[PDB]
Write a protein that binds this ligand. Structure first.
Ligand SMILES: CCNc1ccc(C)nn1
Ligand SMILES: CCNc1ccc(C)nn1
Ligand SMILES: [Cl-]
Ligand SMILES: [Mg+2]
Ligand SMILES: [Mg+2]
Ligand SMILES: [Mg+2]
Ligand SMILES: [Mg+2]
Lengths: 194, 194
């Protein structure tokens, strides 16, 4: 019943553009929407985000997250490791790459989502969420070597999976950080399960 | 270590703007970022709310109440938690209960409310509160709930059992052209991983 008629470019930067989308509403009346798109997509999706489950024997299972300065937020955020998928890279390969770059961990793929939307009222941005396990007892994960790209500046924060939401709430209370909505949604469901 | 130096307006729409952010990197070098922001945030603790609505009915498994709508940025239909922007002077809890009623018909009860969490922090400053709400599906108020959509809102309700949420979302994605929201997928994943 609803569909795009046309798009008008409002403004294009190097990395993002602003568009005005004309669409047909289900009554048959034409309407407009201001939308953002990245300029970088080719690709199943813009990005991957990695849910990294760090498994060490005789330890709690942890979820590995990253803290970075985020210029649109004007502050530090706690997020799943993540980045844009390179042209001709599969989402799986992007996930293992980004996790290795951002955390130094070498992980194994468990599952991969379809493309999911980031903020569909605002943007067309999509990611694959990739669940990866990390065998923390393997020598290659003993002293994990994070390889920042140019201008990345990433702190690794591992939190126990069994208490994730409480630990995130503490960091927020004590550290004036912003938690990512997908991290927080995952932490919620861990508590809400059963 | 890192902070904002300046924020230059590039293009301002009615609803969204593009900015050139200048910031200090942790090597002490000045850099830039193209950032997105809404034009609509005043003194609210966040742009918006998304509601995690847990429908509870005696001798039923608990459902997560989701909504499906056309999203012009995506050029298609999306399945999301019920959500909307916080009106000026409105509390996040009031916004969540109001949006839930407007989008689904249901009258909920507040369970918990997150701090402001970031939607897509590499792209935008957009934040929400994630508000968990229980819906007493045994109350006659919630028997034959009718959405009260606003002008240009056209929302379908989809309630799926919590205990099978990921597979039920996969089956919807298998059956039509639609995208699942990354917060919903995240939450459905954690329900599986717990
Ligand atoms: C980022 C949201 N953009 C919007 C919202 C409403 C309307 C009418 N147009 N554009
Ligand atoms: C929406 C992403 N904006 C960006 C990304 C990278 C750089 C250097 N600048 N701006
Ligand atoms: Cl897992
Ligand atoms: Mg990244
Ligand atoms: Mg990286
Ligand atoms: Mg809405
Ligand atoms: Mg609404």
């Amino acid at each position: 019943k609803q569909y795009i008629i046309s798009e008008e470019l409002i403004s294009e930067g190097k990395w993002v553009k602003l568009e005005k989308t004309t669409y047909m509403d289900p009554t048959g009346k034409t309407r407009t929407w201001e939308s953002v798109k990245r300029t970088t997509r080719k690709q199943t999706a813009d990005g991957v985000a990695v849910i990294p489950v760090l498994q060490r024997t005789l330890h709690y299972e942890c979820i590995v997250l990253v803290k970075q300065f985020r210029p649109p937020m004007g502050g530090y955020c706690i997020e799943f490791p993540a980045g844009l998928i390179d042209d001709g890279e599969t989402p799986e390969a992007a996930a293992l790459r980004e996790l290795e770059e951002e955390t130094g961990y070498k992980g194994d793929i468990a599952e991969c989502s379809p493309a999911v939307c980031m903020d569909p009222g605002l943007s067309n941005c999509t990611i694959h969420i990739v669940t990866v396990t990390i065998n923390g007892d393997d020598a290659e994960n003993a002293r994990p070597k994070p390889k920042p790209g140019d201008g990345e500046f990433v702190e690794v924060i591992s939190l126990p999976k069994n208490d994730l939401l409480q630990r995130l709430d503490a960091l927020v209370a004590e550290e004036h950080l912003t938690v990512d909505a997908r991290v927080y949604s995952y932490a919620l469901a861990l508590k809400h399960a059963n």
